[PDB]
Amino acid sequence: RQLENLVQELSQSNMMLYKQLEMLTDPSVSNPRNTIDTKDYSTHRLYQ
Amino acid sequence: QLVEETQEQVRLLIKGNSASKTRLCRSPGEVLALVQRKVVPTFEAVAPQ
């Protein structure tokens, strides 16, 4: 049980360090800057 | 009367005496089953954590 307590604490440490990695590696923007984005439909209307 | 009561006493002794040797034969076994499957896995598990 005494070792299991530290196992729980280390697992808590591992999960709270797991939860920080995915926030810094989010591909929100998905050369994309050179091309006209289809989501940016204002540029599409401008071209049309 | 003491002899027959002591025969009852001998039965009340042997009911535990016969069980003690059997449970002490397997006394290493169940503790080692707890060792190799529950306690020692937690003994390792701190270090890969």
Cα-Cα-Cα-Cα dihedral sign, residues B10, B14, B16, B21: positive
Method of structure determination = cryo-EM
CA dist A45 and A29 (Å) reads 21
User: In the structure encoding, which two tokens stand for residue B30, read together?
Assistant: 């169940």
Contacts of A36 (CB under 8 A, 6+ apart): A43, A44, A47
A3 touches chain B (CB under 8 A): yes
Cβ–Cβ < 8 Å for A10, B49: yes
Cβ–Cβ < 8 Å for A1, B38: no
CA dist A9 and A3 (Å) reads 10
Chain B contact set for A15 (CB, 8 A): none
State the number of CA atoms in the 13 A half-sphere of A8 facing the CB: 5
User: In the structure encoding, which two tokens stand for residue B31, read together?
Assistant: 């503790």
Judge: B46–A14 Cβ closer than 8 Å, yes or no.
no
